[model samples]
Target: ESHQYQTEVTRLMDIIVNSLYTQKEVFLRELISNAADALEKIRFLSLSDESVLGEEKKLEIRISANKEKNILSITDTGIGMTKVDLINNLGTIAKSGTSNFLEAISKSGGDMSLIGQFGVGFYSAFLVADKVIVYTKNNDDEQYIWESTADAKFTIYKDPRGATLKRGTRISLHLKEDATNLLNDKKLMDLISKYSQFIQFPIYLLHENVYTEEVLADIAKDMVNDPNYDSVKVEETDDPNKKTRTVEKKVKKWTLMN
Candidate 1:
């Protein structure tokens, strides 16, 4: 049987390419799900008696926005897609897994569950990006790059840039004007954590601010409203190579995200 899709695949393509998705940001949720799936696969591999080759527990998902290039990239340190796999997997119109996904979710009231259950998130990339670039490196094969421009025609090429995932994929979305909100870190992080907090993997949203393992007090209205709580600061201790402690003002992490 032909592994590649044929003209008959148009029905499935029309579902999303035309208008199946109303709000396109759902793509973020989908990509994260894919990451989780990859992490799950690696975890399963560890159960076998053979030596587990990969870092199964280090599974992570990250979303980053490039202001200069007007791009939003969703990267997963999960299982990757090779050139042939990309051509075969991506070339197909509707794989059995996707069909099963539809049948499984249709019974659940067909809400956002559709994205979580079936893994249609990668296609959501098309909603925001006119062109999609996928960088992947499988466990047993060399790295590869996949490029597509909305239509069926796509090209798979050897990645000269080399493997960043080593065993996963990075899906980049070149943002369209209508989907520009995705470029903002505030919007991107809020969208991911809100809809995908329960995501099985570590879904990370890129932020310029550095993260630290420190304790901070909640200042009420810029004043010491809560006496029970306080903040502390830590740095590379007095020793150039050791942990240092310093005094920092009390500030709270923003609870309300835009």
Candidate 2:
């Protein structure tokens, strides 16, 4: 179902997107901080009732980008949100779940590394994105999708694809034309190191790389001689004495950023 954002929320969104944050790159920091908070919540919960964690035990954040689609996604295997959370935490500006959590655990002397205070950090996504989509699954509720285009309202619905996340949240930012530079692997790495390097949880980035391997001339010849030779190609070297040939392959891998 769809819901209208509070008037104050619309104003907060405009401020965040237009001028609240000076550097657009801080959006990554805010997102990563939010993910860390979610991870902390699950960790705290798992300490008492292990069953709440289920199969997704790892507490980490992963980031990936699709240059063609202009989409950047951050996924965290952490305490996710229910439908009500989508409305309260996201629709209402400054209603921070982390703050409420702190209040509940006040007697325990809550020592959390949470960076979210006003709960408006999530709105920073609009600084670089034209649209944002969130997929979340909480233990007590079914999976849901929370989506918006920084307009007057947002929408939430049961995820048609089922609970693929298991228990976590995935935020995908449809980047604006000017902010597409944030999709670069180098740029993301720099931002993570600059802002979130000291974060306690592990952060991983999906990196695209061209892998080049050298095969000895004998192995290359043996492969060619065999009838089942695959896509490997032998480079023609000017030096007949050269003993190796090179093969280049494109590989995408997840690398730990922090």
Candidate 3:
């Protein structure tokens, strides 16, 4: 069966995408904060009941971008959501998990700048991407995918990607044409460093620097310019069957600070 958004959800999404958030980059900060909140909840749960903590006890945020795919993904190893959560938290926009979280933290005594208040922050993803895909799994429920274009309805289904996430959520943004700049690793780093650095959680940028033909050509030209002639054995993984291809084109990984 399919589900539809409440009238209030549509109204709120309109406000969030069109007016509330002045900056498009604000969505990243908002999302990261929401992740922190989820992590905090799990930490609190583990305080007395150690059994509740699974393989994903450690808390961290990972953000990745794929220019070729024109998508950006942000993942967190924190408290995930069940199917009910997918509906209650997202299907209904009038009540935000932020407000409930705030109240819980208030009684417990702490602070939270849950941009998720009014459920607008999640909607902000629509400002930069045509569609958003959420993969989440609460310990109580099997992994699931909540997908939508922020139209009137969102669909929920068991994750076809399997249990890739041990716990918590991974949000993938299918970037809009003009929002292609969000896929820039350097820009994402700056955004996280600026807005969410002090949010009391470790945020890591999973940057994969891809080298294409253009980059290889430039490198070859520069090598030719040098007096020392070194044979550059560049391996290209053109074959799909081979697991490891010695390719000129490669993905380099770097871990960056929050």
Candidate 4:
């Protein structure tokens, strides 16, 4: 390692854990911003050839909650980072002119917009997590997981789960007790839509869509009707090959998706 934690990591971690950032929710927004950056990179590349997709599909962002395990994971299919990239980006503080950086930050009272120019987001995890685990797979290489606490040490090891994420990185945060608000499904979705709704890529939440299916059939209802309703209605239409006639409107229990 080029340098140890020094005072840089220590100083940053203290502020982060205390109040460098005003809101704890900003972690969600920052991850989304980074995800958007990744997607933007890929989009700029795909512009050269429309056929490059070649049948491969993609989604933009995926944030999941594991209440049973007390974990929250944010996954993104943006440009994946390699192991070396992870070390360089997440290992040491990346900003230059530390005196100016501190001065500028203090002058603005930690104006978050300055985050765009400042490069300290990797440290922000200390805001909520006691420890952070990153599972990442680059498009060109195999999968690996990076684990760290605020200590001067971090370990990158092979992921035992093989690869839950086929591409990109998934950050699993072991949330502190007070920060459990992030584990709420509804809360997570609201966060994405607010800060990341403008992102041109898809954002996914692990929350499931509640769907209602036929319950009457199981309730010992009359077999007189097809529980999966079938109805016929006269419709007007013209077929180029033949005369279009009546149409069948299949009826079913009304269902609503949450």
Model 3, residue 121: distance off in Å is 1.5
Better of 1 and 4 by TM-score: 4
Q: Where does model 1 exceed 4 Å of error?
A: 1-14, 17-21, 49-57, 94-120, 210-258
Write model 2 residue lDDT over 1-258, tens digit each, in one string: 223344555665665554434577888888998899999999998999998888887889999999889999999999999988776655344342343454344436542223256566777788888799999999999999988776745778999999999999999999989788998988988988897866899999988776567888878666555433223455778998888898544556889887
- Residue pairs clashing, model 2: none
Clashing pairs in 3: 235-246, 235-247, 235-248, 236-247
Error of 4 at 183 (Å): 0.8
Which ranking of candidates, highest TM-score first?
Answer: 2, 3, 4, 1
Could you say which candidate leads in TM-score? 2
Taking all chains together, the TM-score of candidate 2 against the true structure is: 0.77
Best by lDDT: 2
Candidate 1 C-alpha lDDT tens digits along 1-258: 232332323323445444445667777767777777876776577678334445534567767777779888877767676567766665453454464445444555464445444445466576677888888887778888877666644667888877666677888888888788888867876687667766656666655543344332222223324343344334433455433233344442323221
> Candidate 2 — worst ten consecutive residues by lDDT sum?
106-115
lDDT of 3 by residue, 1-258 (tens): 233344544554555554433567778878887788888888888888976777776688888887889989989888899988876755345443333443455457443334465445676687787888889988998999988776746678998777889889999999989789888867987898887766777888866554434334336545434433223334455566644323233344648565
Q: Give the per-residue lDDT digits (tens) of candidate 4, residues 1-258.
A: 334444566665665555544587877777777777877765676788644333335747777787777798877776666778777775446334343565556666765445445766666776777788888876666788888676645678778887566767888898888788888766876776777756777776766432233332223233224445443334433645533343333443211111
lDDT of each: 0.61, 0.77, 0.70, 0.64
Provide the RMSD of all predictions against the true structure, rounded to 1 decimal.
Answer: 10.9, 7.8, 9.6, 11.5
Using TM-score as the measure, name the better of candidate 1 and candidate 3.
Answer: 3
Indicate whether candidate 2 or candidate 3 has the larger TM-score.
2
TM-score of 3: 0.72
